[PDB]
Amino acid sequence: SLPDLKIEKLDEGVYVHTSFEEVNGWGVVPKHGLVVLVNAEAYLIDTPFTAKDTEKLVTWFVERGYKIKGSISSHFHSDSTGGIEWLNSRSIPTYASELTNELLKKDGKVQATNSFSGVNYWLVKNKIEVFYPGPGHTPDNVVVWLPERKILFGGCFIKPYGLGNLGDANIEAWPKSAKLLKSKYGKAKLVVPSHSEVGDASLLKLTLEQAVKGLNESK
Ligand SMILES: Nc1nc(C(=O)O)c(CCc2ccccc2)s1
Ligand SMILES: [Zn+2]
Ligand SMILES: [Zn+2]
Question: Domain 6-218: which topology?
Fold first, then answer.
């Protein structure tokens, strides 16, 4: 009996969707993703945990005149991919990196129907960019950049106050990856993490600090 899916305007044409799980040992965890509008078309940046919540989310925007053109999953964990099966079931195109789909397959999960590879990928040319900084929270994690309003979705890689679940993490690489991300995206106006509140580009420095600290206090 946890809070319900929330949808909230972040900037013009950019919405944050927040869904909720109770995870043993952590308590209630929020999960943020985005819905990005381009004309009468909406793009999901990460899916909620469940089919149910992905249905709610899609319907919210359809009922407002938008076609759901596709969704992109920042990494293979359920908090980014839990809605792929329902989106596939609706013939909404789903995008994940080639590395994420191979991890979905190995984890016994349904994969995204469209895959991409490389450091930079345009989901929508000059409007929605995907960037791979390196392994960190997971081997596959990517971030999503909106050049318009200078908004960076960092997924579960942006971890300003603690790294979270390290089961699938690479703590060796994470400081390397986080320095790179800070370098590329220092001029972001807004940075959206998966599990804490939106902030500015200082969240990139905080993440780098948390990655260094986790490497150091790993010995
Ligand atoms: N679905 C969930 N993802 C994660 C994750 O680490 O990405 C969870 C751990 C909770 C946590 C999140 C942020 C900072 C500290 C702890 S739960
Ligand atoms: Zn994760
Ligand atoms: Zn997470």
Answer: Metallo-beta-lactamase; Chain A (3.60.15)
